[PDB]
Amino acid sequence: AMADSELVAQWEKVQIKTFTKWVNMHLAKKGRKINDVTTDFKNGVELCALLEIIGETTIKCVTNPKMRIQMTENLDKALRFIQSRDVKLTGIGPTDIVDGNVKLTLGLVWTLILRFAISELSAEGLSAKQGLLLWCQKKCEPYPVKVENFSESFKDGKVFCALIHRHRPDLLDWETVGEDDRANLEKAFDVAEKELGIPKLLDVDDIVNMPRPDERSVMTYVAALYKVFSSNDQVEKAGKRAGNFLDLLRATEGMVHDYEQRAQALKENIEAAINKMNGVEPSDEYHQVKEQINETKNYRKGDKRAFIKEQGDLATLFGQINSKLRGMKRPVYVAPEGLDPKSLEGYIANISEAERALRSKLNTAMRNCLIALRKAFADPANATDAKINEYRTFVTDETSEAPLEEQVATLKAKLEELKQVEAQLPPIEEAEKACGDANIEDNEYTDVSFDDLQFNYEQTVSMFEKKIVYIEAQINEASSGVTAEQMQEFKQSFDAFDGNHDGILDKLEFRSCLSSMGLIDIDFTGGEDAQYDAIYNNVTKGENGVSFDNYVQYMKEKNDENPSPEQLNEIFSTIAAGKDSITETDMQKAGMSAEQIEYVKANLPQKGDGYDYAAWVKT
Amino acid sequence: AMADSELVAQWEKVQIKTFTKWVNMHLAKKGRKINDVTTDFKNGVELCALLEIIGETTIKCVTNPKMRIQMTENLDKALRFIQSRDVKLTGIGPTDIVDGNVKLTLGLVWTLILRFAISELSAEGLSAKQGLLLWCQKKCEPYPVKVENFSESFKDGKVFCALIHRHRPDLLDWETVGEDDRANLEKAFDVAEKELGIPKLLDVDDIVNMPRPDERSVMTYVAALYKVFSSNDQVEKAGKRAGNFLDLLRATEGMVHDYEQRAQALKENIEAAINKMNGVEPSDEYHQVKEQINETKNYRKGDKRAFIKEQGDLATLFGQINSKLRGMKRPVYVAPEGLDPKSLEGYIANISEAERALRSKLNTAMRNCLIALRKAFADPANATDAKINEYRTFVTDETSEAPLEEQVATLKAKLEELKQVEAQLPPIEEAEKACGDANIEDNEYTDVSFDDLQFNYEQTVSMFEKKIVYIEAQINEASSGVTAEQMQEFKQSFDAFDGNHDGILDKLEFRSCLSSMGLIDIDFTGGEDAQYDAIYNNVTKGENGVSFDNYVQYMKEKNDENPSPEQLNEIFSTIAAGKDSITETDMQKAGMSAEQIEYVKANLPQKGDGYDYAAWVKT
Ligand SMILES: [Ca+2]
Ligand SMILES: [Ca+2]
Ligand SMILES: [Mg+2]
Ligand SMILES: [Mg+2]
Question: Among its keywords, does the record have Transport (chains A, B) (predicted)?
Fold first, then answer.
């Protein structure tokens, strides 16, 4: 693997051309050019200008050194810059470069290539050459190329083409490679010249002819390739970084758009609700107010909670937007007028104020409504209980001097006055029932039930009617031998059989009366009766009803059928044939039933063989 | 049809015996007897005693007339009695009877037979003989006998037997008749003698022998028969009359029995009810009082009406009983002590008083009950609304001089004091709900809803917590480069993702936080994620939760990833290769997406071919 002294001099000739081609590749950015590194650095000027372009620092070397002192002083300062960056330069003096020593000058051009073209590859344990080799090995994993050194591997040129297709496939077609050594080289150098910007640092003839190309010369060409690729990665890297930053802003805008339309909708909804609440008018009817109170319960359960949630969610979104921007060092976001979170917090407070104002005037309508329902029954009931009780104590009181006919007339007049109260009662009953619909079971305004009114009214009119017939009966006692206490009992029964208080007994009512008394055989079905029809026509005189006067007249006739005491003594005397005693056999001969006989036995005092009927006819 | 002078004298002989037999039939009741009417009336005494027995009047004739003057004076007074009753006696003088004239004396015995034995048959147009004939004709409708006169019809004797079987079949068997003339006669005279009490006024031999019996003689025998039958009808008649009177009394007793047991039951029932009402104790619970008020409604609808009906029905029964007795001239009925109608009217009034007293103390319990339900919610709610509002205005107020660390400490202490109020709230909520069960929708004691408490409490604790982190953030600004306004936004988001306010973010909660921020790929099912599990363990340090300090630390790290403005200028400069402008192609070479590019176009000011990014990096 040793080189030949002929091949060593060939390498140096190649290394001097490629090192020259690398210097003026950088100098051409400043219009400057050198012919030969081993002679054009003897004056020190061209080195300093090359150090200032790769080093980005101003060095003030003499533009036209005529004396060797300026050339050597030139190289003291120009070398000191290289020494400042960490490159080992123990061996060279400035005179070594002025005198034009080939091996040391090529070694000096070599150090600034490592420092300024592939310094990033070094990693404290790996030299710049080794890291660049690993860099070449990685980029060619798919390709059928073998990279073991900088000389033998690149001779075929197949590795030069894989590096460009790995980074920029667009530039050189990959199918037309793998073969010719002039073509694939010239194709790669051409490609690097027109679109990678790299001049053909390597001569196409000098590599195909030699057994092994010079290592350092090939590395210098790769160095330009790596340096332009590091830019391509550095722009891509900045391209990725600026993408993340633009996507966050673009997404953050989408939040600002969503916030603003939601904050506007909230305001608009809260404004619509308040207008409904502020506008409703409470009703004077209970079931209406209950429903109006119920609609505020739907709000507290429904939309109210939703507004409070949306308002708080927006205040979270607003803070989340601003939390991004502050982390991005972006100017904070500020919301449109009247749409910042604190304003929204106010609109919630503004609808809470409208709601509080609404339900307050609703319950005030409710108590006024219930009070009206209690009073709508209590006040007229109290007044009507008082009015009938006024008439009640009057008919109860019998301290008048006034003649009896005047009492009757005044009593009847007072009856008609009380009578009109009957029509007032149905409206009072609805008032208590209207309270049952409003489920009120507590009234502090009155203790009267409606029944008490109906009972008290119906009882007190009866008393009036009962006292009329009583006092009229006293007045008319001589005219008709009917005791006033009998008229009471007649009126009590008549009124009792009068289902509807029309003061007259129906054909149907009169039957139910007589069947009770047992004066006619009973027919529960209600079928026609010729005897009753004849009794009814006779009593009423076809007056279409049994007048009370006609009722009394019938009853008087039934009473008059019965025997007087003195008439009753003669009836018994005839049974006994004229003795104080009535023997059982005396009755049996008169044909009396056994139940009749047993009644006499059980009711008359025994006087020997017979029973003393003198007790009945006491007379 | 003319009689024979021999047969006329035969009739007179028969008429004298039968007229004699008729006189001593009446005289025998006084032990007196005469032999012959044509000779025993010549002294006038026997006529007067016969007139006094049939006439029921005292005549004082001389007991032993010796001179013709007393006999004739006897007959003046004795005849004058007969003349007083309407019998025509134009022809006779007293001397005609003293001298013993047969035809006129028989005519005189004949007139008092018509007047005192069959006078009732006469009916102004029908003589006593004719009416007696019609009386005989009627009683024999079923029998095969012919009655045309008093002589020929009775000769066979078949008509004598029909009269007894028509009135008293028990006495003579009817089958053994229709034939013999001695037998059926002797059988009838025998029957009349032993059980009808009629002596054999007719001789059995004198009728079978003669062609035609004497008319007047047969009529005299029938007259006794009619007179004893009139008694039999008169006793039966009195027997019927006394039956109607006993049946009414017996039935009227059945009413008194029914009244008394019903009047007792009423008293006993009214007494039982009042004891229940007076004994019940009102409850302090609403639904209990409502039911207790409901049980009084069942009474007013149920038993109350029934008591009032029974009381009034009894007052009708009582009057109906007494109305009968007064018509019967019977002593009026009086009810047992405490059971007369007016007493019953009192027991109704007594239970009405217990009912009125009951429902009155029921509604008083009702208002006290409802008032308690309103106050059980109103008073503690008002107190709790005031307490949180006390803390609310305090955290709202920032006028303290006190050092910031002291403010924090005092604020936290005030937070724990307010914190304890959370437990007081659930009991307040039940109090308003307990009002919904009691269907009360009107509260004058407070206007606060329960939601207002829950909102006000939850809002005011948040304010406290929010001010703690704010003031702590100011104090610790130099220690950690986190602006105090950023800590607010961190706490706002942290609290928002904290579902349960335990101050720590769950493994589950933290995911929902990061998925919102888009820092991890979303899985709605919730499946396992190795990347999230690794992010969560790292953040928390296996602390079983994201502490807020750990949350801030994570967020600071995410912010720190972003580029500084001066760092952001260099990123853009590298895209442009060092120009004020960023060309679209400069970005396209950096590989940016079209949406990224359009964002720059739409947001950066145009400066020639490129866009001036100097606005973003304002710095
Ligand atoms: Ca009627
Ligand atoms: Ca939690
Ligand atoms: Mg923005
Ligand atoms: Mg009685």
Answer: no
